[PDB]
Amino acid sequence: AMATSTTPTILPALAAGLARGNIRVVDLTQTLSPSFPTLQLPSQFGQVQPFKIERISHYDASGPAWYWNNFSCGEHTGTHFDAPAHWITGRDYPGNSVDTIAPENFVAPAVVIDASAQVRENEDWLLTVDFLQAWEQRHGRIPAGAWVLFRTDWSLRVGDAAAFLNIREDGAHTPGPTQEAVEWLIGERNVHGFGVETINTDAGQSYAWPLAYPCHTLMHGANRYGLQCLKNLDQLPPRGAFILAAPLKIEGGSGSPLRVLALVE
Amino acid sequence: TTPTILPALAAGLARGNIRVVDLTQTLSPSFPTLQLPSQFGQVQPFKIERISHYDASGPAWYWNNFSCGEHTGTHFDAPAHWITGRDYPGNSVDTIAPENFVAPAVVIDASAQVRENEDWLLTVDFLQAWEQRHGRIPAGAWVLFRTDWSLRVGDAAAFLNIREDGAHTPGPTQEAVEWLIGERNVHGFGVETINTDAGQSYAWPLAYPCHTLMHGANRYGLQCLKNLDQLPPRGAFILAAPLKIEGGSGSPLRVLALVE
Ligand SMILES: [Mn+2]
Ligand SMILES: [Mn+2]
Numbered sequence: 001a002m003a004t005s006t007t008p009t010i011l012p013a014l015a016a017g018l019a020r021g022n023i024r025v026v027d028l029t030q031t032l033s034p035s036f037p038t039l040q041l042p043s044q045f046g047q048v049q050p051f052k053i054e055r056i057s058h059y060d061a062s063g064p065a066w067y068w069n070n071f072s073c074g075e076h077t078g079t080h081f082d083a084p085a086h087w088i089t090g091r092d093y094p095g096n097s098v099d100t101i102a103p104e105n106f107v108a109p110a111v112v113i114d115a116s117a118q119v120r121e122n123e124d125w126l127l128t129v130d131f132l133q134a135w136e137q138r139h140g141r142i143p144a145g146a147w148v149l150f151r152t153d154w155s156l157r158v159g160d161a162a163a164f165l166n167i168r169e170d171g172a173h174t175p176g177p178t179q180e181a182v183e184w185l186i187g188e189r190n191v192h193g194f195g196v197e198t199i200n201t202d203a204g205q206s207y208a209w210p211l212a213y214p215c216h217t218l219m220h221g222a223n224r225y226g227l228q229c230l231k232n233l234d235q236l237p238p239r240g241a242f243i244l245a246a247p248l249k250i251e252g253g254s255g256s257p258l259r260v261l262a263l264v265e
Numbered sequence: 266t267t268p269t270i271l272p273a274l275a276a277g278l279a280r281g282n283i284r285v286v287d288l289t290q291t292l293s294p295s296f297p298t299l300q301l302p303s304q305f306g307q308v309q310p311f312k313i314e315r316i317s318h319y320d321a322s323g324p325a326w327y328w329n330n331f332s333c334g335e336h337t338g339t340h341f342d343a344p345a346h347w348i349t350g351r352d353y354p355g356n357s358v359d360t361i362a363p364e365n366f367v368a369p370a371v372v373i374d375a376s377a378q379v380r381e382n383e384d385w386l387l388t389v390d391f392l393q394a395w396e397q398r399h400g401r402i403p404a405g406a407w408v409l410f411r412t413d414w415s416l417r418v419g420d421a422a423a424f425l426n427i428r429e430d431g432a433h434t435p436g437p438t439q440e441a442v443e444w445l446i447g448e449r450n451v452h453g454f455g456v457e458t459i460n461t462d463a464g465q466s467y468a469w470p471l472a473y474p475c476h477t478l479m480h481g482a483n484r485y486g487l488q489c490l491k492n493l494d495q496l497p498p499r500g501a502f503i504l505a506a507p508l509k510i511e512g513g514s515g516s517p518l519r520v521l522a523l524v525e
Contacts, residue, residue, distance in 0.1 A: 002269060009525050010273045010283065011502045015369045017270050019405065025363040032359075033511040046322035049330045053510070056306035056334070063305055065348045065477075068514045070309040072332035074316070079509070088325045099292075103285040103521060107504075109275050145279065216326075242271050244367075244504055246519035249339070250313070251293040254328045259506035259518070261363060265268035 017265070026241075026262040028230045029079040030158060032071075036078050037161040039199050048074035075255045081247040082201065082216075082226030086254040089221030096223070098253040105225070106246035108192045110147035110262070111139070112236045119152040119175045123166060124205055127177040129184045139238040144190035147227070147243050150177070154197040155231035165199060176203025179214035186222050194219055195227035227260060236262055277525065286501075288490045288520040289339045290418060292331075296338055297421040299459050308334035335515040341507040342461065342476075342486030346514040349481030356483065358513040365485070366506040368452045370407035370522070371399070372496045379412045379435045383426065384465055387437040389444050399498040404450040407487070407503050410437070415457040415491035425459060436463025439474035446482045454479055455487035487520060496522055 001022065002013045017023040030036065038050040051073040057063025075098075076082070084090030085097045095101045113135055118125045127150065136142060152175055157164040166173050175198070177185075185191045194201050194215055202213040211217060219226060227245060242263040248256040277283040290296065298310040311333040317323025335358075336342070344350030345357045355361050373395055379385045387410065396402060412435050417424045426433045435458070437445075445451045454461050454475055462473040471477065479486060487505060502523040508516035 002273070009500075010270065010277050011369075011500060011523055011525055013270050014274060015502060018364065018367060023270065025367065027363045027509075029509045031509050031511050032513075041323075046316035048316060048328065056308065059348045059351065065473075066346060066514075067348075067351070068308070068335050068346060069510070070332070070334045071510065072330070074330045075328050086326055086328060088319045088327075091319065091327070103287045104278065106519065106521060107278060107285065109271075213325075240268055240271065242275065244506065246504065246506070246521055248517055248519055249287075249289045249291050250329075250331065251291050253292075254326075257508060259366070259508055261366060261506055263271060265271045 022265065024264045026232055026235050026264055028232050028260040028262055030155065030229050030231055032073070032078050032257060037158070037164040037199060039076065039165070048076055051077055073257065075250065075253055076228070077257050079229040079260055080255055080257045081245060082220070082228065082255045083247070083253065084220040084223050084225070087216050087220035089217055090223060093223045098247040098256050099249045099251050105192070106244070108145060108147055108243055109143060110149050110236070110241045110243045111142050111239050112149045112151055112233055112241070114151045115175070116151055116153035119154065123173045123175065124203065125175045126203060127175070127181050129178070129181050132181060132184065142189045142191065145192050147193050147195050148185060148191050149195040149230065149233055149236070150197070151233035152197050153234070155229070166204070171207055172200065172204030174198045174200060174204040176201070176206060177215055179209065179211055182214045182218045186218060186224065191224070193225035193227065195230055197230050197233065199228060201226045201228060230260060237264065240265065283523055283525045286492055286495050286522040286524055288492050288522055290415070290489050290491055292333070292338050292517065297418070297424045297459065299336060300425065308336055311337055333517065335510065335513055336488070337517050339489045339520055340515055340517045341505060342480070342488065342515050343507070343513065344480040344483050344485070347476050347480035349477055350483060353483045358507040358516050359509045359511055365452070366504070368405060368407055368503055369403060370409050370496070370501045370503045371402050371499050372409045372411055372493055372501065374411045375435065376411055376413040379414065383433045383435065384463065385435045386463060387435070387441050389440050392441060392444065402449045402451065405452050407452050407455050408445055409455045409490065409493055409496070410457070411493040412457050413494065415489070426464065431467055432460065432464030434458045434460055434464035436460065436466060437475055439469070439471055442474045442478045446478060446484065451484065453485035453487065455490055457490050457493060459488060461486045461488060490520060496524060500525070
């Protein structure tokens, strides 16, 4: 529902659409809580803090008319955003941290790739170029400047931290893209970024590939972005959704937790 | 079926017809921290520590840990934050209907007045005069109070502006708050200061009318905004989604504004 000029303004129409219910708002964010799975690296590396929250007052002696908390966590805690500075191949880009990235990049279209049935039968399942090209045969070309949201239904494991991280003696076993798929998405489709439901955009076992963690290496290496621990991807269409993903303005931040929202029309 | 608005929005952003404005202050240890009388619980200042920096602690990556409060820097005030809004359903940042995280805004410029009086008060007459000039304030819209107070951010003492008789920062009167809520049905109130209420309103017989009445009416607040000088009087669209902190009374957030 828009105006009657050849090239009108969109924001009035947008506001009215959201109010009417023509455009819905979907929450793709997990809840920040002390029970949320915390990533653990081998002991030789520095570790991220888990989410901790402590009450300051609760309408009581400490604060008779108000209630509020202090909290602590890591940049890469829960539903969060990966800036290019996070990886060594993206260290030297000008606007590569969450406080310097051009604000325009915090809003973008998205496509959703559903592989939940495949991951249900293989926790190490790999997203391939062949699979992506078959997707386009059904839903059309992946548009340049769009998020690629990898739906795996992995978010349903959030109640079980052991199941969510899914770690064995040889590391984490989680699904992810092949190097060729990452190269194709960047070079042939010029995507905005890569979004997952897991605690890693890369496949867990890709630490041992010739080029370790290809998604982190190549996406950040090409000044692109990442999203992690997304949920409710099953409520999104294959294409047409619009993502609101603005990270905290942390000085020199390599990433931050954020409230990821999807607009659906 | 066939969408019409969202493709136009994406296209407009890509072509440059629609601009994105960052209304957010940078989170850093040097940013002014809210301070209360010593008998009350205090909010933690923003601190940050490196985990690794492409070194032995993490050969190919860089990342930090950090700690702060829900009410640090540019942040979002939820109705559960105040005792009058504690009983509303969906009153915390994890339970508020997500539809409330996007809303239009009006921008009321009082920079000229505040520059001559640090304790300047937003009154009903000023708002009604504003409407005669820029139209009626629409229901469900943010009321963004421009004071250019954000320019004081480099000086913590000047930003908080506390003297022996409390803080001296601009804000609305009780009548103004009641009017905006009861007669216009606004979405919430947003300011460039660390307080949506006037600093001296702590001593008013009805202390902190904005916090008390706005949250008491299941409405919201934004603190420590900036770049309000780049927004039109009306027509701006605000993106303000708070962190999904479990039972959170608020959170820091990235506040954006779409302008065309
Ligand atoms: Mn991350
Ligand atoms: Mn606050």
